Amino acid sequence: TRPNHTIYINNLNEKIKKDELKKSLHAIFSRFGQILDILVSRSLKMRGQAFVIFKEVSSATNALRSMQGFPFYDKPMRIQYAKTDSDIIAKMKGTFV
Amino acid sequence: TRPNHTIYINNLNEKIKKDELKKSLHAIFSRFGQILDILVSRSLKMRGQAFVIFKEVSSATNALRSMQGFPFYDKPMRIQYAKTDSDIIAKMKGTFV
Amino acid sequence: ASYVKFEVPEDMQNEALSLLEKVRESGKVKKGTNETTKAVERGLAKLVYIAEDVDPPEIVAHLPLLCEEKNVPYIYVKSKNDLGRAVGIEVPCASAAIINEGELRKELGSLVEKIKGL
RNA sequence: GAGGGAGCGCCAUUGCACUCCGGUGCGAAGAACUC
């Protein structure tokens, strides 16, 4: 997929409450640049994805080369770029990715 | 230092509240094995430091080698081993007094 | 003086503030005058505290009369500072309201049944 | 403003704990946050 300032992570641990999950993404991705918003899925039963929205695409691609496969809560993140404005739709629809 | 079940992390970002920080360190350290406890305080003398108590010292040394200098909250952690066993490790060998 | 509709004697005010120091660890109390005005019109309050020395009287002046309209007990206490340390906050507090009868209901029902006799 | 309900700054601190505990301005007379 072509670059985009939002990265789309899945294989996130589903069982983890979501404020904590957002904050733990922040813990590990603030290093790469200003985050406008962290957007996690909901919930618990369906799988786990989240969009982290960087403000500059170079930071997003930085997250992606670096944190690929990193074991977040003992589950290696499968990380790619978000597709054509997937994040703004996922925030609509209600419920939460 | 001699290896130890417990790692001593410092140069942590001190602006972050206690439970958020404990659960961010479980997020990035669970990977290396069972964590018996994570002890953080923000007393004047314990700002910016945390103790992570692994159950097997191999988890501690794999953790200390992998996460060395990892920018947690945009700040490279200093990981070394704890100088003395944590009380709970002490009781598991008992040793505790 | 003078949005106080009735006077109440010191040591009944003091089991009141100490009793409210003890209800936070069984039930639930709402602190500050916006959450207590909201405790009451929601229709949930079971007894509400008003400080006597709040300094634009109008901050709490509507509380006595919007306790009489839907029949909620209320008690006056002298310093907002003591109600502040009573509810557990670190500033002063103009008015509070217990909202859950977690387990001490007899001991406050007595206390209300002392509010009536004035 | 409507919601909301307790934090938000500054100075100092690089500090090895497992009884808790620096200073200080603002904050229930409403912090953060959402709209």
Residue numbers in the entry:
A (entry chain B), B (entry chain A): 6 to 102
C (entry chain C): 0 to 117
Question: Any passages from the paper?
Answer:
One especially common junction element is the kink-turn (k-turn). k-turns are elements in double-stranded RNA that introduce a tight kink into the helical axis, with an included angle close to 50°. A standard k-turn comprises a three-nucleotide bulge followed by successive G•A and A•G trans G(sugar edge)•A(Hoogsteen edge) basepairs. k-turns are commonly-occurring motifs that introduce sharp kinks into duplex RNA, thereby facilitating tertiary contacts. Both the folding and conformation of k-turns are determined by their local sequence. k-turns fall into two conformational classes, called N3 and N1, that differ in the pattern of hydrogen bonding in the core.
In the course of our studies of k-turns we have determined numerous structures of HmKt-7 removed from the ribosomal context including three new structures reported here, all of which are N3 structures. Moreover, the various structures, with resolutions in the range 1.7 to 3.1 Å, have been determined in five different space groups, encompassing hexagonal, tetragonal and orthorhombic symmetries. Several include multiple molecules within the asymmetric unit and altogether there are 17 independent structures, all of which are unambiguously in the N3 conformation, and all in a closely similar conformation with a small RMSD values. In the ribosome the k-turn mediates an important tertiary interaction, and is bound by the L24 protein, and it is likely that these factors force the conformation against its intrinsic nature. A given 3b,3n sequence confers the same conformation on different k-turns irrespective of environment including those within the ribosome, in the SAM-I riboswitch and in duplex RNA both free and bound by the L7Ae protein.
